Design a protein around this ligand. Structure first.
Ligand code: FC2
Ligand code: MN
Ligand code: MN
Ligand code: NA
Length: 259
C-alpha cells in the first residue's frame, strides 16, 4: 500500500518515538546491567513518556517489550534479569512502538565496555550495509537490487547475510508486504513506488550464515556461534529517494536522502 500524507506524518511520529527509545537507553547500556532491566526501562519510557506501546510485547507470543540480542545471538533475544552485559559485548536492542495506529521499527548495535576489533568491524560494516541500501532507495528501483547490494558488500568483508529474516513493509501493521530480503533472490520482484514504507534490517554474521533457534522458542544464535549484528531503520520512499523515519543523533547518514 502507498501511505497517504496523513499516514506518513503518523509514521514520522511513530518512527521518531522508536528512534528516541534507542537514544534514551544508550546511557544504560554498560557493563553490569541486565537485559531485563534495559527492557523495563524501555517499556516504562514508551508507555509513560511517549504514551505509546511496544508492538513486540505479545506479538506472535513474544514475552518482552524490546528484543535484546548479544554477540552470537542473531535476533529475538529475550530480555532477562539474569543476563548481564559484559566488557566487549556487542548488543542489539530492537524497538517497535505503535503510536496513533502506526509502527516505528528500528534497532542499533551498542558496543559494551572496551570494543574488540571484530566487534567494531562487524557492527560498522553491518550499519554500512544498511546505509548503502538506504542510499539506493528511490522510485523505479527493484528491491532485488538492494538486497543484492547488501549481500555483495557484506560477503566482501568475509561476513554472511542471515537468510531466515528480512525487512518488511510497515504501517498500521507491524509486518506488511513487501518482504525486503537482504540478499539476492530470484523470488524478489518489487519495484519501489513513492509512499511505500518499509524497513531494511540486515542481520550479518561474522561467520557462516546458518542459524540455530534455542529452546525457549525465541532466541536465535549463529549455528557456528560467531558474532552477529543488525541495524534497522524504517523509511518512506520519496519522489527522488527516501526519508529515514527512525534516524538517531548518532546516525552518520542524512535523514533525507536526495537523488
Ligand atoms: O524488526 C522486526 O521486524 C522484528 C523484531 C522482532 C520481531 C518479531 C517477529 C516475529 Cl515473526 C514474531 C515476534 C517478534 Cl518479536 O520482528
Ligand atoms: Mn525491529
Ligand atoms: Mn523490522
Ligand atoms: Na548478535
Amino acid at each position: 500500500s502507498i501511505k497517504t500524507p496523513e499516514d506518513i506524518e503518523k509514521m514520522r511520529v511513530a518512527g521518531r518515538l522508536a528512534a528516541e527509545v534507542l537514544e534514551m537507553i544508550e546511557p544504560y547500556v554498560k557493563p553490569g546491567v541486565s537485559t531485563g532491566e534495559l527492557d523495563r526501562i524501555c517499556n516504562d519510557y514508551i508507555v509513560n513518556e511517549q504514551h505509546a506501546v511496544s508492538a513486540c510485547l505479545g506479538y506472535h507470543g513474544y514475552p518482552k517489550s524490546v528484543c535484546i540480542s548479544i554477540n552470537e545471538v542473531v535476533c529475538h533475544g529475550i530480555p532477562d534479569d539474569a543476563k548481564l552485559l559484559k566488557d566487549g559485548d556487542i548488543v542489539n536492542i530492537d524497538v517497535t512502538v505503535i503510536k496513533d495506529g502506526f509502527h516505528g521499527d528500528t534497532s542499533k548495535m551498542f558496543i559494551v565496555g572496551k570494543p574488540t576489533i571484530m566487534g567494531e568491524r562487524l557492527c560498522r560494516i553491518t550499519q554500512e550495509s544498511l546505509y548503502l541500501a538506504l542510499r539506493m532507495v528511490k522510485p523505479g528501483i527493484n528491491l532485488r537490487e538492494i538486497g543484492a547490494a547488501i549481500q555483495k558488500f557484506v560477503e566482501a568483508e568475509g561476513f554472511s547475510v542471515v537468510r531466515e529474516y528480512c525487512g518488511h513493509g510497515i504501517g498500521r501493521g507491524f509486518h506488511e508486504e513487501p518482504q525486503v530480503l537482504h540478499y539476492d533472490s530470484r523470488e524478489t520482484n518489487v519495484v519501489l513506488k513513492p509512499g511505500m514504507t518499509f524497513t531494511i534490517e540486515p542481520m550479518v554474521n561474522a561467520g557462516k550464515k546458518e542459524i540455530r533457534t534455542m529452546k525457549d522458542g525465541w532466541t536465535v544464535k549463529t549455528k557456528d556461534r560467531s558474532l552477529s549484528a543488525q541495524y534497522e531503520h524504517t523509511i518512506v520512499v520519496t519522489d527522488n529517494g527516501c526519508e529515514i523515519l527512525t534516524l538517531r543523533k548518532d546516525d552518520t547518514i542524512p535523514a533525507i536522502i536526495s537523488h
